[PDB]
Amino acid sequence: GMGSGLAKYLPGATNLLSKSGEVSLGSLVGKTVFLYFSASWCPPCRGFTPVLAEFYEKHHVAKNFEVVLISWDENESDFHDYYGKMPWLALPFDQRSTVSELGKTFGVESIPTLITINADTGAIIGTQARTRVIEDPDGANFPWPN
Amino acid sequence: MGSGLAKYLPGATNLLSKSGEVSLGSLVGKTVFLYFSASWCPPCRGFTPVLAEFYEKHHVAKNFEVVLISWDENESDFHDYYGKMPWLALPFDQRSTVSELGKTFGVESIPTLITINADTGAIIGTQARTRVIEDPDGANFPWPN
Numbered sequence A: 001g002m003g004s005g006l007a008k009y010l011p012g013a014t015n016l017l018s019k020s021g022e023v024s025l026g027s028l029v030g031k032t033v034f035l036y037f038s039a040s041w042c043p044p045c046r047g048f049t050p051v052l053a054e055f056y057e058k059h060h061v062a063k064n065f066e067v068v069l070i071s072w073d074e075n076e077s078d079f080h081d082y083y084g085k086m087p088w089l090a091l092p093f094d095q096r097s098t099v100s101e102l103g104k105t106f107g108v109e110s111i112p113t114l115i116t117i118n119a120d121t122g123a124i125i126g127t128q129a130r131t132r133v134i135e136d137p138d139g140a141n142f143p144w145p146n
Numbered sequence B: 001m002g003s004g005l006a007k008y009l010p011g012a013t014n015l016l017s018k019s020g021e022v023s024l025g026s027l028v029g030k031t032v033f034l035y036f037s038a039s040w041c042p043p044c045r046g047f048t049p050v051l052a053e054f055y056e057k058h059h060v061a062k063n064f065e066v067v068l069i070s071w072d073e074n075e076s077d078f079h080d081y082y083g084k085m086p087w088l089a090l091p092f093d094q095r096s097t098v099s100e101l102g103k104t105f106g107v108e109s110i111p112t113l114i115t116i117n118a119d120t121g122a123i124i125g126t127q128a129r130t131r132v133i134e135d136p137d138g139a140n141f142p143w144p145n
């Protein structure tokens, strides 16, 4: 077992959904993590997700980060379909009861929203990456601290 | 103007209806449900037709009105969605006020109904979305509990 600073905000979470199966929070040691508050049916999310996917494909290795979907979907089949087409990780559907309070904790007032977190400490690096990705597509100023 | 709905909607004048606009004053003496919703939200899309049935049966006899408060940002979605509904709507040009209205009543998800006395603006319930399911004949309307 390995600890994780993400457990500061996901104390009920252990595994994340991934394209390789499941990954522990501990597996993200040393990384920058983006919590991506989104939903399958939200129109502005539909416009943003491909932009974030392109950024992810380009930079996630060289800039040592992961993206974890935090979905507002309340329908499990919709959740899996939506996440299936993304390239990154997801908080499992069985954590859906925590999503509202997690949004409140980070001052999420609408979606899409990105919250940038240090995986080791749980420190919030930034809250504006949803726009910075568009402003800075090659991530010159990543991870966009204030 | 004088109605207690005006305390919540200071930038509004009129609400949309099926036959053109109506004043806030036209709701004098009514129980009013503020219906926090969005055209693309699945539980809303499932609840709207249920609420429509409830409205059609009871709105006259139990002297209430429903007012759509929509999270829609796309005007074509708004008009189409409100087109499914028999009741009133906060006009699309007031949509910038929807979030603060949600915060006024502690709306933390949708669909949500907030029940208000129109004249005084008093909140008389927050659980009507649930009560409509359990009590579709409105025996316990307006559900003080």
Ligand SMILES: Cc1nc2scc(-c3ccc(F)cc3)c2c(=O)[nH]1
Binding pocket: A039, A041, A042, A043, A044, A072, A103, A108, A109, A110, A111
């Ligand atoms: C399209 C859309 N869907 C959703 S699902 C949840 C939200 C949302 C709204 C307000 C908040 F304070 C937090 C999330 C939200 C939103 O803002 N827009």
Ligand SMILES: Cc1nc2scc(-c3ccc(F)cc3)c2c(=O)[nH]1
Binding pocket: A072, B038, B040, B041, B042, B043, B071, B102, B107, B108, B109, B110
């Ligand atoms: C489907 C859906 N859409 C929307 S659009 C806005 C909301 C929402 C979310 C959180 C709040 F505090 C208020 C509204 C919301 C929601 O909760 N569910």
